[PDB]
């Protein structure tokens, strides 16, 4: 039950600063350190900052300006990470690490889900759930296909779910295509039984975090 | 600070088969206690990293014993036995005993299955996305190995090109299968000037080509 549970995507004009948090369970928070890794999206890992709540010790890998800033409060055993000045080169996931308390080796032996910040002058855009009707042409005998098409939102990401997240097996969510507009676009299906299309409910949740959209679309059959 | 170089990028194995990854450093990692200190983390899609190694061989709780470490001064390795479906990822290597700790490059590791053909299907434009004055044809390849797979999109007959856009799937982590999306997109009168919408796809799976096409007027 060691957990980091970091903060929601997050997009951001140039110039104008991000807050990550990194709220943890399972362990004496004062006890420990947290060390903050930058994944450059498709890049390797890059360390970026240590910080001890229990020296008040912090090291930085690159930081001559002051953009970044590592931060905690013991009370509520939450780590911070601030990065002011945004550039387009700051896109990236942001991880937190749970690591050493003082001047020992670096473990980081568990880890936050990750933040994506992304750093556009674009402004944000909603996305459009179009349905993928199951028909005789998605059915190959038992198995029916069936699924949603998130078209034109910018920026990602956009996560999808099925029913609320009661129906994840057989769900194939695709990787972000890159359009000529430069907006994004996507599809998730799923394949399910095909006796069972009269009788269930397959709804698209999809979430878009950056434009605050969130759109449920209902996929029922074409004959 | 010291500059952890992995190879190879890429590894792919059959399952069953071993794996070999290769983490060498500018610096040697023999720490002043005497104890030399290397980490393994593993990274699954959309998901952060997972420690699986610590001190060059330590296992971490739940880490299985397929996964092993090894290596001295400047060179180590991690071995995996028998590589299984769920091994699908990229892999690190991180050194934590110098002033900033490194990573490495990261090597994806992909998985060799037995072929298993596509299940082929094709969904018609929506009438909302017609309305909004665009259409877009999706054809789904569902379920595939090996990855390589050729998607041609005919319209009355006539063979396209530059039109349509492709993503796949990560490698399932159960099946060790992919999964390949083909969007043909086009504007409503490019869409309306045509009745026989097709794809035709090709892979090492299937005997012949299969083609799922239908009419615009009916779905």
């Known amino acids: 039950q060691v957990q980091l549970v970091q903060s929601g995507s997050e997009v951001k004009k140039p110039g104008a600063s991000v807050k990550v948090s990194c709220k943890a369970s399972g362990y004496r928070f004062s006890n420990y350190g947290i060390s903050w890794v930058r994944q450059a999206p498709g890049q390797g890992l890059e360390w970026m900052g240590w910080?001890?709540?229990?020296?008040?010790?912090?090291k930085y890998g690159n930081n001559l300006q002051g953009r970044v800033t590592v931060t905690t409060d013991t009370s509520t055993a939450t780590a911070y990470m601030e990065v002011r000045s945004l550039t387009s080169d700051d896109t990236a996931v942001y991880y937190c690490?749970?690591?050493?308390?003082?001047?020992?080796?670096?473990?980081?032996?568990?880890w936050g889900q990750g933040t994506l910040v992304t750093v556009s002058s674009a402004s944000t855009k909603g996305p459009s759930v179009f349905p993928l009707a199951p028909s005789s042409k998605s059915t190959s005998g038992g198995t029916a296909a069936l699924g949603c098409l998130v078209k034109d939102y910018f920026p990602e990401p956009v996560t999808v779910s099925w029913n609320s997240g009661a129906l994840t097996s057989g769900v194939h969510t695709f990787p972000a295509v890159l359009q000529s507009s430069g907006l994004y676009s996507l599809s998730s299906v799923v394949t399910v039984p095909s006796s069972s299309l009269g009788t269930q409910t397959y709804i698209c949740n999809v979430n878009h975090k950056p434009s605050n959209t969130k759109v449920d679309k209902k996929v029922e059959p074409k004959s | 600070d010291v500059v952890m170089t992995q190879s190879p990028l890429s590894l792919p194995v059959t399952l069953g088969q071993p794996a070999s990854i290769s983490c060498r450093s500018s610096?040697?990692?023999?720490?002043?206690?005497?104890?030399?200190?290397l980490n393994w983390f593993q990274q699954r899609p959309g998901q952060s990293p997972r420690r699986l190694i610590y001190?060059?061989?330590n296992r971490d709780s739940g880490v299985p014993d397929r996964f092993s470490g090894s290596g001295s001064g400047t060179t180590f390795t991690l071995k995996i036995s028998r590589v299984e479906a769920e091994d699908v990822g990229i892999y690190y290597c991180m050194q934590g005993s110098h002033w900033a700790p490194t990573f490495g490059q990261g090597t994806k590791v992909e998985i060799k299955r037995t072929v298993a053909a596509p299940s082929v299907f094709i969904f018609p434009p929506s009438d909302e996305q017609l309305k909004s004055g665009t259409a877009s044809v999706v054809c789904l390849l569902n379920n595939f190995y090996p990855r390589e797979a050729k998607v041609q999109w005919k319209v009355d007959n006539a063979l396209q090109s530059g039109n349509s856009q492709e993503s796949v799937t990560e490698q399932d982590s159960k099946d060790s299968t992919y999964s390949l999306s083909s969007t043909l997109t086009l504007s409503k009168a490019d869409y309306e000037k045509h009745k026989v919408y097709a794809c035709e796809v090709t892979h090492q799976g299937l005997s012949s080509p299969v083609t799922k096409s239908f009419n615009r007027g009916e779905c």
């Open positions: 910080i001890s709540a229990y020296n008040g010790n912090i």
């Open positions: 001190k060059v061989s």
């Open positions: 610096q040697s990692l023999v720490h002043s206690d005497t104890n030399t200190y």
């Open positions: 690490a749970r690591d050493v308390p003082a001047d020992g080796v670096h473990f980081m032996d568990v």
